[PDB]
Amino acid sequence: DLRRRLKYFFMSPCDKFRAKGRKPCKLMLQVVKILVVTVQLILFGLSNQLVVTFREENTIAFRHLFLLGYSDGSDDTFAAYTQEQLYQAIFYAVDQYLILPEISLGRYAYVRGGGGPWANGSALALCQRYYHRGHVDPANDTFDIDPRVVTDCIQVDPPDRASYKNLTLKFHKLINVTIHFQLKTINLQSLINNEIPDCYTFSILITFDNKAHSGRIPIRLETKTHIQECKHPSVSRHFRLLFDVVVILTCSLSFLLCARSLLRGFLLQNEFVVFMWRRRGREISLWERLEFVNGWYILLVTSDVLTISGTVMKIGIEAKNLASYDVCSILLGTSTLLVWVGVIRYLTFFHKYNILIATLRVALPSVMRFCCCVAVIYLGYCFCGWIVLGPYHVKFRSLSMVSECLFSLINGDDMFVTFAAMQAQQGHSSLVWLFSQLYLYSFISLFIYMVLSLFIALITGAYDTIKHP
Amino acid sequence: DLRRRLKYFFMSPCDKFRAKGRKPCKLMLQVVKILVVTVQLILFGLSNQLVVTFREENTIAFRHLFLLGYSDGSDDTFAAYTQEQLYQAIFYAVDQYLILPEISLGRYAYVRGGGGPWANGSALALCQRYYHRGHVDPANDTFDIDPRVVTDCIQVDPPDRASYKNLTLKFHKLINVTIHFQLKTINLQSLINNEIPDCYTFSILITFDNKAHSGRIPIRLETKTHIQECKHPSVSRHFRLLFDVVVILTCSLSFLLCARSLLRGFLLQNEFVVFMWRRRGREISLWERLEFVNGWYILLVTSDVLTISGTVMKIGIEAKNLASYDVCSILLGTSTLLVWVGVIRYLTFFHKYNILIATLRVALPSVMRFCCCVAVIYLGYCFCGWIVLGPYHVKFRSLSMVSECLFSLINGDDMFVTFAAMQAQQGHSSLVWLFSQLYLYSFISLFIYMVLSLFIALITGAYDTIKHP
Amino acid sequence: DLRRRLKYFFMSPCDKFRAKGRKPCKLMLQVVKILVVTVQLILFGLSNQLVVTFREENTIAFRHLFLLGYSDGSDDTFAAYTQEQLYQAIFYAVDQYLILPEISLGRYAYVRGGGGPWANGSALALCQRYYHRGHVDPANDTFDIDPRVVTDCIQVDPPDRASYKNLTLKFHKLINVTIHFQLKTINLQSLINNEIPDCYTFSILITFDNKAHSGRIPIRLETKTHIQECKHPSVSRHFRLLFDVVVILTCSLSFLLCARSLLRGFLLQNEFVVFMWRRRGREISLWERLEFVNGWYILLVTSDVLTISGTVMKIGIEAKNLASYDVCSILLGTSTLLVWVGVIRYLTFFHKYNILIATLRVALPSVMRFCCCVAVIYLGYCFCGWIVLGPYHVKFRSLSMVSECLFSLINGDDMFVTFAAMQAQQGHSSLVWLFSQLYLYSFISLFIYMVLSLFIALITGAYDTIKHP
Amino acid sequence: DLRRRLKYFFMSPCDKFRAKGRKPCKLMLQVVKILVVTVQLILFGLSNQLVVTFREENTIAFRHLFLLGYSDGSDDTFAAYTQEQLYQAIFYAVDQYLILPEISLGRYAYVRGGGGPWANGSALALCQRYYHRGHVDPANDTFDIDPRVVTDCIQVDPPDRASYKNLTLKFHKLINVTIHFQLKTINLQSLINNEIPDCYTFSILITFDNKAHSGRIPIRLETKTHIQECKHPSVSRHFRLLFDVVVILTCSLSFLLCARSLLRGFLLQNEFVVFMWRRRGREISLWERLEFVNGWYILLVTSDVLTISGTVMKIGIEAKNLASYDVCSILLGTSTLLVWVGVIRYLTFFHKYNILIATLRVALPSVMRFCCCVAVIYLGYCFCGWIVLGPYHVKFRSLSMVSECLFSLINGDDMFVTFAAMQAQQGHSSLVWLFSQLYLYSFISLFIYMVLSLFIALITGAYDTIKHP
Numbered sequence A, B, C, D: 001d002l003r004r005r006l007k008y009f010f011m012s013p014c015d016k017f018r019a020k021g022r023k024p025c026k027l028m029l030q031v032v033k034i035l036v037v038t039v040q041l042i043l044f045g046l047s048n049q050l051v052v053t054f055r056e057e058n059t060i061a062f063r064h065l066f067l068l069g070y071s072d073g074s075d076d077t078f079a080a081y082t083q084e085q086l087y088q089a090i091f092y093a094v095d096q097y098l099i100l101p102e103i104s105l106g107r108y109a110y111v112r113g114g115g116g117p118w119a120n121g122s123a124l125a126l127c128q129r130y131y132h133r134g135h136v137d138p139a140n141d142t143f144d145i146d147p148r149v150v151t152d153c154i155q156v157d158p159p160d161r162a163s164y165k166n167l168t169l170k171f172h173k174l175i176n177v178t179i180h181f182q183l184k185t186i187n188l189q190s191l192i193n194n195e196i197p198d199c200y201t202f203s204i205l206i207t208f209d210n211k212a213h214s215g216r217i218p219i220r221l222e223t224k225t226h227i228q229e230c231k232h233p234s235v236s237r238h239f240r241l242l243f244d245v246v247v248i249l250t251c252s253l254s255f256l257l258c259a260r261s262l263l264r265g266f267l268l269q270n271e272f273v274v275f276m277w278r279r280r281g282r283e284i285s286l287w288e289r290l291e292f293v294n295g296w297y298i299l300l301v302t303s304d305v306l307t308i309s310g311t312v313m314k315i316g317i318e319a320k321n322l323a324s325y326d327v328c329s330i331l332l333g334t335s336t337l338l339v340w341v342g343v344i345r346y347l348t349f350f351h352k353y354n355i356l357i358a359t360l361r362v363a364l365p366s367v368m369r370f371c372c373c374v375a376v377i378y379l380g381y382c383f384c385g386w387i388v389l390g391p392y393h394v395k396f397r398s399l400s401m402v403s404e405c406l407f408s409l410i411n412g413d414d415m416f417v418t419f420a421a422m423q424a425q426q427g428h429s430s431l432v433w434l435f436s437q438l439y440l441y442s443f444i445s446l447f448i449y450m451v452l453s454l455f456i457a458l459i460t461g462a463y464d465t466i467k468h469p
């Protein structure tokens, strides 16, 4: 048993072609896959961008239409500070709603009965929520509260082509005021993509938030969007359904070939392993079995499955049976990234072109072992900064934001702005400012000078082991 | 005397378990400590955030209520430039104060007699301060000044449900005008945390600062906050007092075990040292005694003490006997960081996982010796930039800010903005701008290219000494 | 055949001078070329800057003159949100146009018949474009559209020293409104450069873009500029035409000398190659022939040709036969860069001064081979981020912008701002935000820690091979 | 001749003390010098800051008093766009000037005859400048210009407690309009520093710049400041004159000791050199003579001279014989930096503390040789970017600013903003944008990946040569 088949298996495509009449089908498939998958992603992106733009621009238009005195960029400071201001804002929202068709540049339709759960069939609900009992008397340092939340609702209806004016807010025990209503509009711009326009229903919520009871009432407008096909569409003028099929067939072929290669590898591993058990004791091999498994074909199969799922979802969206543009975009984009990466398989046969992969495979164990110890320090800093500085520092507001701030600091990014945020307000206490000084200096100097230096040293050390000289 | 006990002492928890019936209690304790201390920090953070938000939002509301024409973001340029503007601002502040209940969204109560030290029982004090004698006559390049500061006060009282209008400011010798008053409000939002609301007393100071006599009078509003429990609270609806006890008991157990280990180490060191003095001359060992001391147990004991102190302070705050949220937050956060870090003790038994610690211990002496020489250069630059460029450069205003700017520059951060601040005004003199050019180029090129390179070289050199190959 | 000529050829200028009576003409030429080409670039820059400034300042003035309520910096958010606002903006533009001479600080002349292609001889065209048939009825989730674009035009003429007021916009099917007109003005500031002023014709287009049909209509103003000489110029007061000739002659001399050197090298290579074919088998040498070619002379010849072309174009522009300032500026600037770089030729004879060039020549093959594998990963990330995040992330809007963002991220620049753009809106979906987290963390950690580290290792490895020790 | 004196000379202070009764006077002097010079710098900084703040705040106040509609931050876009706007701005400036005492918060005095050179004894000059002959007729693409500048002046005088209203601007040939006047005020805040207030004369120039003739007229206000002592000052209440003498004496002592050491070194070098010429041929030594010269004493002497000059200038300023605060601040700050640095002399005797200095001395020759080649590339890029992109890119406006931009780019700073400035306007031509892409990508990749990597490699290589292992 000379066993030249083992050597044949771990051969490059050129070597396999020189050996047998083996034309490389997987490689040319992968090139075609890169081209077609990238083109499909871009084609989908046209429609996806149209949808996102429609949503965002309608929301901005609503903010200008319904928020008294609103200007772009003021969103996070937009607030009322007097009873008169609050009343004027609420009444302005309702009044603008009642005359929308006469003023708006967009073609909106009212949605009868879309006033929210506290609506009783009316199209707009004007709700104020307050404590069941509130007896706030700071003058005597006394209060009597029943924290039960009471909802008082006023129903408003559009004229088919007043009551809300008599609103009396219980300011001292007010929790919030909300305005709920729905508007319907058609995304006509989809015609530029030879698609039939969909019906969009925007659910608009305006909140006057007094939950802090701090004398300042933040005002915000949020929208939910529901996309569905029009009941009676008609376009007079009215290819990629076949391009999606082409992508699907290419990815199916790649999947089949890669699965055949994986089964071949499994069989070869099993035959070699039993022959070895015959050559010496039985059960010699524990991990070389895994070495027989090449992860590039696994990656390719995963990418094929993701691409097929994305293509099917895209076909459903075009067919109007689905409106999940974000999920489809994520599937297609991840697939595109993986398809581009997978071609690296054929560069690993040439050591001069495989520096990155070889280095990574030799460095990963030590890197992971080092990161075990770095993780505890990093998480301790994350939690400490999140709780201690979160109230005072804009960049420490949430756990994910604290992580972003610390990760950027490790990379030397946004350092002075991080210090200056504390200089600006000192945390309104010299002790908090001093703590921020210690926290930031220590974290930056540790992670930049020791952790990152040693991490890089491990990477370059691995490279030094694998480089030919 | 075979002395296997010495070897037993410097053994890993797994080795100690294999040797005797020694179950690792300190390690599992540390894991439990990490969990419970982190959870306690987050739980405290809920309340701490509520308090901070109340303070900040009330201050912003005051700025909008009392500062004529105030808009968010203008705080550092907000100023008056004419006598009419100054008078209008002062009168607007007082007028808004007198009608606060009718306009404010928050429920504020006046504080009778809270008008400050220059108040004589009135709730608002309107004070102007000027030189005792001022005869400023620029026309003749003459002046006659008695720098004694005279305070002239006007008392204002709220209506229990005018005089200040006749204010005549001595502009040519005016130092500043201040408005002092106090407002009381209840932080009702604490109910969301199942806590009883506290009474907050805000001390409000508005300053029209003419100390520069420059024709521009900066206007600012500052608040002090005093938190105390309400006299007669009553909430109808109304666990972590036991979680704090759990944390305290866990940290006490860890403290006891670590102290026992430290005493054991001391005894072992003393016995080994006398046996060595018997084996050879007396008083051989000078520093290995210190090697017998393991600093991880010292760190753990310190963390336990800090955690207990923070927990006790938190219990006091909940009990309403204390309102020091910043001190408690700092104690708890530092404790959390130290508790997370301390688990690294058990990674030091495995050289593959101890790269950071081992490198640091070998590199620290050379790093400190190098930093001795770098410190003099750094401090010279700090003082030079603080005095020479502080007047002209926003980022060189104070010593701490100069240090932040230089430290960020060392890390390659905010470079062009630092240059552009000087380009914008040139320091209003070509000589100062040229000096800034030399200062910045020299500091950046020295510290980035030589100091940091050599510092990193020392770190990686230490790592090269300690890495197995 | 001793063949000392080969050794003579690969000799330094000092060695050649010591050998024969060879004075270095190319080196002194290159120094003179650097001086004269740099001076010529700066001299041209005077005029170029004047032209650019005229264009930009006129455009800003038009934006202030014709865009109702326009303020600097609002350009990308400037939009209308109500029918009244749109009508007011359009009418304001036309009204300001009709009274331009009475109000504008610049001296503009109307251009009769410059109203655009849809003008029928009038100086201003006010066009609205809408669908041929539009029956948008969101109320019933129905529409009937003929996507044919209909253009309806109103002609306006200036008074030689109304109809447009009756404009009725078809809002529900409106695509856009445009205002086209032309203005003529003289760039008098060119007199400061002793040049005769040119006639500028600005083509002004104002667009009210409703292509999104989103209830928000962006308003923008764009200008095309046409530069031509005045028919009857007359300046009473009225050197570098000779400086351009000097530059041309210097570059011609350099070109001739370098071409002679290249021909000499070719002849020497051909003689050596045939002598070698005589010494051993025929056709021994395959690539040393190319080694006989020195690329510095090729670079110099290219720079000479570019400098001559730029100088000729500059002479044409001065003569008023050409107005292509950007092309000329690019030719002259590239030439200047190349002329400065080319002097490095004479530093390559001294190994202590040739570190950069020698390192680069040894490192380039491995660097290119490594970049082959890095390119696929980089392009996969580029496409994925462009499509998936382009709609949600300001820095991922276009392919070139995505490339700029990723390239800057590789260099550790603008990291936290990139994360915060996603924090601000979350992509309006938690799934998109999570994907952005994974995308950014993975790309940054891969490219900063592995790719860049290995790239630098390759560079320093090459340097280690070429450094004398 | 055993010559132990040579070895004695190159000995550390501790070794010299152990050898003879040599107490280290220079070292303790240097410590005292650091303390006293730093304190003196800070003390001077108090006064310097007061002066700068007075100047800046008065200028801001003038901008608010005289610039119609001015708001903070608008300075670089502040401009007029219509004839009415221009007239209103000019008249507002003059009107506000005429009622300054009634409105301003500062105490300003008019300066009779301070209206500038074109004033004929009046306190305010209102000048318009225009071409001697201007016949701008864009309608016919004709012009007739006599570029001679004609100045037409209107004199305005303050009421001692109209004509300017009839100003007719020649818009079509207007070059600029200026308003010149002077105001006098006293810097009373200097009293807080126990100093007698000085008289400040502000020269105010307001420019309406039409030099571009672009339909947009930038408006700016600039001030010159002249400081002189008051004629008749009188302060009722009214140490560092002795602290300056203490600094002077300390620096004189250091100077004398260092000069004595330098003379000693010269004599020792001369004696050793002649003894060597006796031991072997004459004129053996060429450069070791220079090795006998220690540059730290030269640095110290330079620092002493600078400190003495700064102290004398500071004494003159306090005495009111001088007002050059910037020159004095620069002298004192540079002196402080040098005094701090000079203490490094005593760390060079201990190799563990001398890593930086030793590395630098071994690396400097190779670093300078490498920088020779890098300089040509850097300068070529600087000039190319300055001319080609200066008109289009905010960060390439001037040579110094281009250098700052490129230097920051080398350090990885402000990269995406540099790209985005070009994305925003594309240079208003796709060709310029493409060139910017090539320019930036090439410069960044070359300088970050090759130049900086090799520079650092040279530094660390030198360190590797000098490190003990």
Ligand SMILES: CCCCCCCC(=O)OC[C@H](COP(=O)(O)O[C@@H]1[C@H](O)[C@H](OP(=O)(O)O)[C@@H](O)[C@H](OP(=O)(O)O)[C@H]1O)OC(=O)CCCCCCC
Pocket: A009, A011, A016, A022, A023, A024, A025, A026, A027, A256, A257, A258, A260, A261, A264
């Ligand atoms: C269930 C899957 C059936 C696969 C049938 C393939 C039959 C066939 O012709 O093989 C050559 C190529 C595909 O073959 P392909 O996958 O490209 O090539 C194989 C790989 O090179 C493999 O090595 P690795 O790359 O390292 O895993 C090697 O061991 C195999 O040798 P071996 O076969 O001697 O053991 C090759 O055949 O065929 C086409 O070009 C597609 C024709 C389109 C119709 C495909 C119908 C599915």
Ligand SMILES: CCCCCCCC(=O)OC[C@H](COP(=O)(O)O[C@@H]1[C@H](O)[C@H](OP(=O)(O)O)[C@@H](O)[C@H](OP(=O)(O)O)[C@H]1O)OC(=O)CCCCCCC
Pocket: B009, B011, B016, B022, B023, B024, B025, B026, B027, B256, B257, B258, B260, B261, B264
């Ligand atoms: C005053 C303190 C009294 C400590 C009493 C402990 C008695 C006991 O059972 O030991 C085993 C563990 C704690 O024991 P623990 O501290 O976890 O374990 C010790 C450490 O491993 C130590 O090495 P280092 O880690 O390197 O310092 C080793 O030398 C000791 O061996 P040795 O004793 O043979 O000399 C171990 O006993 O006990 C519990 O699991 C807690 C039971 C809860 C009740 C604790 C009451 C305080």
Ligand SMILES: CCCCCCCC(=O)OC[C@H](COP(=O)(O)O[C@@H]1[C@H](O)[C@H](OP(=O)(O)O)[C@@H](O)[C@H](OP(=O)(O)O)[C@H]1O)OC(=O)CCCCCCC
Pocket: D009, D011, D016, D022, D023, D024, D025, D026, D027, D256, D257, D258, D260, D261, D264
């Ligand atoms: C014209 C200058 C006259 C200098 C007179 C100094 C006479 C005196 O006492 O020397 C010891 C110290 C100063 O002496 P000082 O400069 O601190 O010390 C000298 C340095 O250590 C020098 O080495 P380097 O540091 O490497 O250059 C060394 O060669 C000299 O040895 P040598 O003399 O045997 O050749 C030392 O005397 O004296 C005071 O402590 C100041 C007393 C205040 C009054 C000073 C009056 C000026």
Ligand SMILES: *[C@@H]1O[C@H](CO)[C@@H](O[C@@H]2O[C@H](CO)[C@@H](O)[C@H](O)[C@H]2NC(C)=O)[C@H](O)[C@H]1NC(C)=O
Pocket: D129, D149, D175, D176, D178, D207, D209
């Ligand atoms: C207003 O325009 C005039 C005319 O261009 C400028 O006058 C020049 O001023 C400079 C500096 O004061 C002199 O060196 C020149 O000789 C003057 N004449 C010319 C023809 O340049 C004047 O500088 C401008 N004023 C401002 C404030 O920009």
Ligand code: NA
Pocket: A411, A412, A413, B411, B412, B413, C411, C412, C413, D411, D412, D413
């Ligand atoms: Na950086």
Ligand code: NA
Pocket: A412, A413, A414, B412, B413, B414, C412, C413, C414, D412, D413, D414
């Ligand atoms: Na940065």
